Amino acid sequence: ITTPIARGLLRVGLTPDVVTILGTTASVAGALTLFPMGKLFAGACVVWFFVLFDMLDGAMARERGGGTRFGAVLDATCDRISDGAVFCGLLWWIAFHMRDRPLVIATLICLVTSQVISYIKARAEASGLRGDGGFIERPERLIIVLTGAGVSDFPFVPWPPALSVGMWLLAVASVITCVQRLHTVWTSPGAIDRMA
């Protein structure tokens, strides 16, 4: 399915980089429009939709002979922007409509740790070390927070506490992941040799 769509996009002169940006813009607009209004199930559906959309830029890149280093950096940077918009959008609902200050704390931990978890991996690789793995990578992050948000606002059978359950589980697991990833850095070949 993605292959004929990708080819059709290449055919009209779109590039993987433009499609990356367009999908990210749409996801961000969706998260920042729907979550602050309390439309958490709709917001989660829109975010998941653009997760699916995100299969197209990689498919486009493979078809035309390969991805680029800029494309990889752009794609990963857009992932951070997207994650940020999800948590900021939810934060707005939680802070100003639910007025739930403990949940704001969990949400802010999730927001910062999402960025920090990804940063450890990139910064480690920039030094020739490893810094991947751990409990929470981007797929687990999105499954947890979007399922919490979606269930909390689910049609006909909503369970509002689901939003808090997801955010607190994610916050704890994300802090642990930071420590795990730093431990992976520390054990990498060459990580602790002094360089004058």
Ligand X SMILES: CCCCCCCC/C=C\CCCCCCCC(=O)OC[C@@H](O)CO
Closest approach, Cβ 10 to ligand FQT, in A, equals 12
Is 116 an interacting residue with respect to a copy of itself (CB under 8 A)?
A: yes
What is the Cα–Cα distance from 118 to 133, expressed in whole angstroms?
10
The answer to whether the CB of 118 falls within 8 A of the CB of 59 is no
Residue 35 exposed, middle or buried by CB count within 10 Å (0-12, 13-18, 19+): buried
Considering only residues 6, 85, 86, 136, which one is a binding residue for ligand X as defined by CB under 6 A?
Answer: 85
128 contacts 190 by C-beta, under 8 angstroms: yes
Q: How far is the CB of 194 from ligand FQT (least distance, A)?
A: 8
Is 132 noted as a catalytic residue in this protein?
A: no
- Binding of residue 176 to ligand X (CB under 6 A): no
CB 103 within 8 A of CB 171: no
Residue 173: CB partners within 8 Å, gap ≥ 6?
135, 136, 140, 144
Closest to ligand FQT by CB, 21 vs 172, is 21
Q: Does residue 179 touch a copy of itself according to CB under 8 A?
A: no
**With binding defined as CB under 8 A, does residue 90 bind a copy of itself?**
no
Compare residues 9 and 44 and give the one whose CB is closer to ligand X.
44
Instruction: Please tell me whether residue 130 adopts helix, strand or coil conformation.
Output: coil
Annotated binding site: 17-20, 54, 57-58, 62, 68, 75, 79
**Looking at the annotation, which residues are catalytic?**
79
Binding positions for ligand FQT, rule: CB under 6 A: 16-17, 20, 48, 51-52, 54-55, 57-59, 61, 67-68, 71-72, 74-75, 138-139, 142
